[PDB]
Every structure is written in structure tokens, then in C-alpha cells.
Write a protein that binds this ligand. Structure first.
Ligand SMILES: NC(=O)c1ccc[n+]([C@@H]2O[C@H](COP(=O)([O-])OP(=O)(O)OC[C@H]3O[C@@H](n4cnc5c(N)ncnc54)[C@H](O)[C@@H]3O)[C@@H](O)[C@H]2O)c1
Ligand SMILES: NC(=O)c1ccc[n+]([C@@H]2O[C@H](COP(=O)([O-])OP(=O)(O)OC[C@H]3O[C@@H](n4cnc5c(N)ncnc54)[C@H](O)[C@@H]3O)[C@@H](O)[C@H]2O)c1
Ligand SMILES: Cc1cn([C@H]2C[C@H](O)[C@@H](COP(=O)(O)OP(=O)(O)O)O2)c(=O)[nH]c1=O
Ligand SMILES: Cc1cn([C@H]2C[C@H](O)[C@@H](COP(=O)(O)OP(=O)(O)O)O2)c(=O)[nH]c1=O
Lengths: 346, 346
């Protein structure tokens, strides 16, 4: 029900995947991507589909003058733009404060001015940490053993804290000014086009480059994995059918500890089960994340389609193997940056 | 008295100036450096009497990283009161709230991290949102969740409360991620000497003294938990010197009252008819009832409020504004004029 939408952060991982989704399934919609092209922005993620349906505008979401020019011609804003890596936020929180909070505020004021639709894309990390299933009476199935729309905010890092802060002002702008906004908090995404600084693609590409995979500590931490294609359909459902002012949780019930994920990657790529390095653990590292997506399923009828992790991972490994020119120019620089704060445990 | 050289941000304001006076009179071994921007709310007269070898006033912005670094380099603690504190102003122009409440707190946190010094964040009960009236609660206000506690979910309604809540979140993340030595306090509505005339109680008192009729938003059923600024001061001191690192403490004196009954008591004490006031346009997103359970502070730190008699406290406050008319007479006209731009008798 929208014809001219702005997608911020559309040259990144999750955002570019959403743009591809629109280009393929809703050809009647025009998309204007607003992206600053930081270390994480890549024109290659959109180059093949740029045209009458999709255009790219290079700029900052904190640039009020530019945002005003674009907002005056749109009927909706889908907001993905952000500094998204915890490890980078621990080394230098500056850009997180700027982009995640000030950037969201700038966009909210534009939505208010032109009275248009706004969907805020956020993360499950705003809720903090959860204990491992082995230490819970309900084994992870009981009340409060998973995140729900009623869970309190309790972020652990500069990244999750600035995202949570942005969630708070979006909701305040709805109650105070009647902005037409909705919010989504999603679990860990994986799939094609994810930057190699992130867990899954870092291990896959290190192996392809003849470098040892890296595991933080002993790998006890748990993440709830969801394929980006399912994140895309969830956001589209909320954008077009959601209730104004509501928050929806997106997840596919795919909890796994880092150790088992790395072991699956090694096995699929024909490597020995112990061919990896244990490395310096992350400060304030979150233990377990888990999402209860009952609300979105019940109210909007959304159902994830990529629930077979083994197959999804197999296809992801093949994509990075078939598109080595997409990441090879960044491998040395990313690993060198990590070497400044991480070393092999022994 | 473990801290000998402290910085008090926003010390030229209402609550902050009362805290500086408290330190001057009860902890003579402490030197105080006040950092205040002197906005419409800052007033040098609130500190004049005690300025000298023991208390210094430095005019500046908490977002000025260079100035903050210079002052932090010679301090052993920072007590943070600086902020844009009025909901009504935040609804008219959120800009200064974004700047001061969030960016300002971030700047101070980085300075505390660099020099590894104590940091106490002064916050509000409004970060928790709103509560139903006691007559509409199954436990009449005495049951679980019928009052705010340290476990209550954040759910701010306005630009003011959401920016304050946002600052609370990054303070907690800096503790978990970087080991910053911070504590947080969330307090109920303060009243007493030196409060700006834009606030509820002082506005009604001074309006009567100036020949202007009091103003009540709607029917005045909204409820607030009143505490005398002197008890807020001793509460912050207990948390600063004995509080557990990383913990949040709620400050309150169990004094819930509805706006209507508070205004009537004022009219009565100042010899005015019970109907000598006007009903005016209600506040957008206006919060219903606020209530604080201060058990944690009382039980764990041994703190107890001394001004539990509201009638007596209010009497002394009316007397203060009556004996110090030169302190506010010059601002009366401007404040009421600003209000007239959005408020009309109904
Ligand atoms: N990675 C995940 O698993 C995940 C899971 C849930 C929610 N989220 C959220 O999804 C969104 C997108 O995540 P991602 O993994 O695709 O991130 P990403 O790192 O892959 O891409 C971020 C993108 O935003 C752009 N950007 C950064 N600052 C900008 C600014 N000031 N103005 C304009 N563009 C700017 C970058 O150029 C880049 O293209 C974020 O808001 C993130 O918090 C991420
Ligand atoms: N008034 C209340 O009932 C109340 C209740 C609970 C919590 N609080 C909190 O208590 C603190 C103080 O409240 P208040 O009523 O005394 O406010 P106030 O309006 O009386 O004073 C604010 C002070 O901060 C200064 N200031 C504003 N922006 C600044 C900046 N960028 N740099 C430096 N100084 C700046 C102003 O000049 C002023 O002296 C706030 O953080 C507020 O959120 C207030
Ligand atoms: C980047 C990276 C992450 N990890 C871990 C840390 C996290 O528990 C998990 C995913 O990390 P990451 O991809 O950074 O995502 P997020 O912090 O948002 O969940 O993988 C490793 O073990 N090794 C690595 O090289
Ligand atoms: C300033 C003012 C406030 N009020 C009400 C609104 C609030 O419920 C209450 C206190 O308002 P206020 O002093 O602005 O404090 P806060 O919003 O931080 O609680 O008094 C009036 O009825 N009339 C007025 O003129």
C-alpha cells in the first residue's frame, strides 16, 4: 500500500536483501536507498538491480537538509541504517552515538513533518542476556525463558544500548506526536552479502583463504539464527499490515551455541573438527539470546520458510565460495583490525 | 567524605543547587566545582551565598568535551544533574533534550572512563511510564507492580522522559562493557525552595502572589509522589558513598497526591476561594499516576526521609516564595506568555 519508499542502510547486509525482495516481488514500488557507504556499505550489493525501480543516494541519515528533500517525495521510510557491530562499538562508540541515536531522531522529525509511515528495524539485543537452557527450570520453554514483547530493556554494550535508546524515542514520538510508526526486534541474521567481520561469514571466508577460524572463549554462547529472507517477509508484513505503535519480535526458533555452528561449518567444508583457534573473549559478552515470535505469527500470519539451518548454511557457504571477488579485497584488513585486540589462547 | 574534589553538573538549577548547599553545610572536607550552562533554568543566585574557596562555578556545556576533560582531570567524582527537565518544553522543541540529556551524558561517561573516577547519574521516575489510579487497581496500590520498583520496565511517554531513559541505558552499558564506577537514582516529583516558576507547585503559588489565577490541566485527577528536595539530597549522598556499583536505587517518601487536592491546599493556605482557578488544555500524552517503592534504598543503605509532612513542607515553601519575590518577579510575565501559546481556559 506504498508506492515510493525510502530504505535507509539499503547498501548493507539486511537492508540490501530487503531491497532485492521488493525489486522481485513488488515491481510496482519505487525504492530510494539512502546509504552513507561506511566500511559496511557496498555498491556491489545493489549494482545489478539499479534502474527505474531502484535508485541509490549516497548520504548521512543525520543530514537534515538531505533527509528533508527525500522525505518530501516519499510515502514511507523503512529504517535499517546503523553501526551494527558490538566489537567495533567497544573500540570506538562515537559513530554509534551519531548514527544510531541522532540519525533515528533526524528521521523521526522528518516523518512527523510530512506525516508519513515509519518502520524501525531493531535487534533482540535490546533485551540483554538469558541463562543457558541447562540452567533453567523450564529448559528454555518456560515463562520468561525467552524474549517477548513484554521483556524489559537491559542492553549490555554501546551497540545494543544505542539501538535500545533509538527504540525508546520512536515509541515516545508515537505517543507524543502520533507518528505512524512500528518497531521490529529480530534475532541473529545470516545469509548472502553479510560483511566478513561477522561470525558466520568470517569463519567461512577464513577457511577459503587458508586462515584458521576463530572462536571466542570455548564457544558456549547461544544465538537464535534466522535467514535474512525470512526477516524481509516479516518486515514487509509489519509495514503493510501492522498496528500503529506496536512492537513485533521476529525469530525462527533456531538456537545454537557458537561451538556447534563452527563445527558444522568445518565439517561441511571438509576440514578437521579441531582446525580452529580459541581467542580472547569479548568484554561483557552476552550469554544466550532467544525469541518467542508468537505475536507476529498469531496477528499477521507470518511464517518463516527457511527453518532448516543445515541447508541454509550449506547454501550460504556455497555463495561465499562462488563469489570470492566480493570479499577478497577486505580479508587482510579485517583480520588485521582484529589482531589489535584478539590473540590465540594458549 | 571519601571524595574530596567533586564536580556537580547542573548545580545552578533547582535540585542541584540544593545538593551543593547540602554538601557545603554537612561535608566541609569536600571542594565542589559546579559545571552549568546557565540556560533559562540556571540561576547564579541559587549559589551566590556559598561561592568562594569551597565552591566554584564554571559556566559551560556538559557536551563540551575539551572543557569536561580539563575539569575531570582534577576531580574524584561526578554527580550529574544537568538536563533539560520540562516535559512541556520538550513537546514544543525536542532539540535541546536530545543534545543535553543524551549527548551530554555520553560525553561525561567518556570522561569518567578516561580518568577512572566515580559517577552518579541523577534520573527520574518518569522513565517507567504511567500507572493506573489506586481505585482502579486490584490491590489499591499495595500489590505487586502497583508502584515502581527497581525491576519495573522502562516505558517513557515523552521526549523528556525518553531522552532521560536513553541516558540511563548507556550508563548501565558503560558499567558492563567498560567497568565505569557508576550508580543510578530515579526519584519522584521534588518540591521546595528555588524551583523554577514553570513547574506546577511554584507556578500556582507565584501566580497567586502576582494576582494571576492558578492553572489546572484538565480535571486534575493525575497523581504525583511528592518528596522534599532536602530528602533527595541525603538520598543521593547515601548512594554516592555507599551504593553498590552498577545498581539502580529509587528515591521516594510515600507521598502520593492528585493535582486537584494539591492546588486546593495551596489556595486554602493562601486565603483564596476554593474555585479561584482555571481549567486548561491538557498535556499531550500526559502521564496518569506515578508512585515509588523505596524499599531497596531504605533496607540496603539505611536511608530515611525527614520531611514526611507535606502540609508543613508546602507551608514553608509558600513562605519562601513570599519572602523572595525579587527572585522570580522578573520572569513571571515571560513564562505565562509562553504557556498562552498552547494553553487556553476550558
Ligand atoms: N546483523 C544482525 O543480525 C542484525 C539482527 C537484527 C537487527 N539488526 C539491525 O538491522 C539493521 C541492519 O543491520 P546490518 O547487519 O545489515 O548492518 P550492516 O553493517 O551490514 O550495514 C549498515 C549499513 O548502514 C549504513 N550506514 C551506517 N551509518 C549510516 C549513516 N549515518 N547514514 C546512512 N547510512 C549509514 C552502512 O553504510 C551500511 O550499508 C541495523 O539497524 C541492525 O541494528 C541487525
Ligand atoms: N524537578 C523534578 O521533580 C525532578 C524529579 C526527578 C528527577 N529529576 C532530575 O533531576 C535533575 C535536575 O532537575 P531540576 O529540576 O533541578 O532541573 P532544572 O531545570 O531546575 O535545572 C537544570 C539545570 O541544568 C543546567 N543545564 C541544562 N542544559 C545544560 C548543559 N547542556 N550543560 C550544563 N548545564 C546544563 C541548567 O542551566 C539548570 O541549572 C535532572 O536530571 C532531572 O531529570 C528532576
Ligand atoms: C566475529 C566472531 C564472533 N564470535 C561469536 C561472538 C557471538 O557470541 C557470536 C556472534 O557474534 P557477531 O557476529 O559479532 O554477532 P552479535 O554480537 O550481534 O550476536 O559469535 C566468535 O566466536 N568468533 C568471531 O570471530
Ligand atoms: C505546570 C503545570 C502542571 N500541571 C500538572 C501536570 C502534571 O501532572 C503535574 C506536574 O507537572 P510538572 O511540574 O510539569 O512535573 P512533571 O511533568 O515532571 O510531573 O502538574 C498542571 O495541572 N498545571 C500547570 O500549570
Amino acid at each position: 500500500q506504498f508506492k515510493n519508499i525510502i530504505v535507509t542502510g539499503g547498501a548493507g547486509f539486511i537492508g540490501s536483501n530487503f531491497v532485492h525482495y521488493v525489486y522481485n516481488n513488488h515491481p510496482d514500488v519505487h525504492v530510494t536507498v539512502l546509504d552513507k557507504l561506511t566500511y559496511a556499505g557496498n555498491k556491489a550489493n545493489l549494482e545489478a538491480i539499479l534502474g527505474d525501480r531502484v535508485e541509490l543516494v549516497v548520504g548521512d541519515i543525520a543530514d537534515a537538509e538531505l533527509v528533508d528533500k527525500l522525505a518530501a517525495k516519499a510515502d514511507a521510510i523503512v529504517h535499517y541504517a546503523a553501526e551494527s557491530h558490538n566489537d567495533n562499538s567497544l573500540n570506538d562508540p562515537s559513530p554509534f552515538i551519531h548514527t544510531n541515536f541522532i540519525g533515528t531522531y533526524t528521521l523521526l522529525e522528518a516523518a512527523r513533518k510530512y506525516d508519513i509511515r515509519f518502520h524501525h528495524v531493531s535487534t533482540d539485543e535490546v533485551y540483554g542476556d538469558l541463562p543457558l537452557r541447562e540452567d533453567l527450570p523450564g529448559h528454555g520453554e518456560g515463562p520468561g525463558e525467552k524474549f517477548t514483547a513484554e521483556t524489559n530493556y537491559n542492553p549490555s554494550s554501546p551497540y545494543s544500548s544505542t539501538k535500545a535508546a533509538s527504540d525508546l524515542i520512536v515509541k515516545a514520538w508515537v505517543r507524543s506526536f502520533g507518528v505512524k510508526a512500528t518497531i521490529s526486534n529480530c534475532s541473529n541474521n545470516y545469509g548472502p552479502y553479510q560483511h566478513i567481520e561477522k561470525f558466520i561469514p568470517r569463519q567461512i571466508t577464513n577457511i577459503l583463504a587458508g586462515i584458521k577460524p576463530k572462536l571466542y572463549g570455548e564457544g558456549k554462547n547461544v544465538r537464535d539464527w534466522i535467514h535474512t529472507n525470512d526477516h524481509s517477509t516479516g518486515v514487509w508484513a509489519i509495514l503493510t499490515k501492522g498496528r500503529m505503535g506496536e512492537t513485533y519480535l521476529i525469530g525462527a526458533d533456531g538456537e545454537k551455541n557458537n561451538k556447534e555452528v563452527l563445527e558444522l561449518i568445518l565439517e561441511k567444508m571438509g576440514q578437521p573438527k579441531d582446525a580452529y583457534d580459541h581467542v580472547t573473549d569479548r568484554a561483557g559478552h552476552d550469554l544466550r539470546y532467544a525469541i518467542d515470535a508468537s505475536k507476529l505469527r498469531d496477528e499477521l500470519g507470518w511464517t518463516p520458510q527457511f527453518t532448516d539451518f543445515s541447508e541454509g548454511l550449506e547454501e550460504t557457504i556455497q555463495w561465499y565460495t562462488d563469489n570470492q571477488d566480493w570479499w577478497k579485497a577486505e580479508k587482510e584488513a579485517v583480520e588485521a583490525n582484529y589482531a589489535k585486540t584478539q590473540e590465540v589462547i594458549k
